[PDB]
Amino acid sequence: MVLSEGEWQLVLHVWAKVEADVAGHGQDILIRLFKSHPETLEKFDRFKHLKTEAEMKASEDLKKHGVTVLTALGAILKKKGHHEAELKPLAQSHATKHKIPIKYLEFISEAIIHVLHSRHPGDFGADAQGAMNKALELFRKDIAAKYKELGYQG
Numbered sequence: 001m002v003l004s005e006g007e008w009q010l011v012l013h014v015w016a017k018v019e020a021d022v023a024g025h026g027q028d029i030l031i032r033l034f035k036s037h038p039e040t041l042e043k044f045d046r047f048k049h050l051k052t053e054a055e056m057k058a059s060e061d062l063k064k065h066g067v068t069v070l071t072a073l074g075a076i077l078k079k080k081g082h083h084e085a086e087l088k089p090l091a092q093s094h095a096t097k098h099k100i101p102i103k104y105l106e107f108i109s110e111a112i113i114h115v116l117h118s119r120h121p122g123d124f125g126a127d128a129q130g131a132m133n134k135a136l137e138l139f140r141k142d143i144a145a146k147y148k149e150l151g152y153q154g
Contacts, residue, residue, distance in 0.1 A: 001138035007131035008080040014116055014124050014132065015074055022074075025115060026066015031056045032111040040104055069108075077135060083142070091146035095154065102144050102154040109136040 003011070018025045031053055034041045041048050046061040056062055072090060076083040094100035113132060116124050124132075147154040 001134060001141060003081070003131055003134050003138070005080075007127075007134065010128040010131045011077055011135050012080075014120060014128055015077055017120050017123075018070060018116070019074065022067050022070050023063055025119070026070050027057060027063055028115045028119070029070070029108070029111045030062050030066045032115055033108050036111065037104075037107045040107060043098060043100065043104070073139075076139060081138065083139075087139075087142055088146060091143055091150070094143075095147050095150055095152040099152070100154065102140060102147070105140050105143065109133070109140065112136065 034050075034056065035053070041050070044061075044065070047056075047059050047065075050056050050059055050062065072086075076086045076090070079086055113129055113136075116132065117129065144154060
């Protein structure tokens with residue numbers, strides 16, 4: 001996986017917009033994920049009892065979780081590929097602590113692209129979406145590498 005500098009800039013450009021309202025983006029993304037794939041909800045004991053979008057939007061746990069997820073992602077994306085140090089840990093965790101499947105990461109990637117497109121359609125075009133997809137794909141592969149490198153078959 002390799003993105004051009006122009007492609008990383010497209011990614012970083014849309015990401016600055018996400019940072020203008022991390023909380024709102026995290027809620028959109030997480031709800032989109034739980035609505036598209038309800039089984040994923042079972043992996044969160046603090047808000048796995050949330051059923052409606054209303055209950056989801058009112059959840060402080062989901063909101064805070066969205067902010068933590070996006071913050072960690074935003075930090076890895078800014079590395080533009082050299083994110084080993086900001087990844088070794090994002091791995092040891094979901095590998096030994098939560099056991100988050102690779103397929104679920106594919107689910108959240110779809111929610112992220114959908115939400116970014118929906119909230120910023122004027123700039124998040126085919127080029128930007130293609131670069132973000134490549135970025136998240138690179139991200140999934142490296143995480144899967146750390147898993148495998150650690151015995152976990154996510």
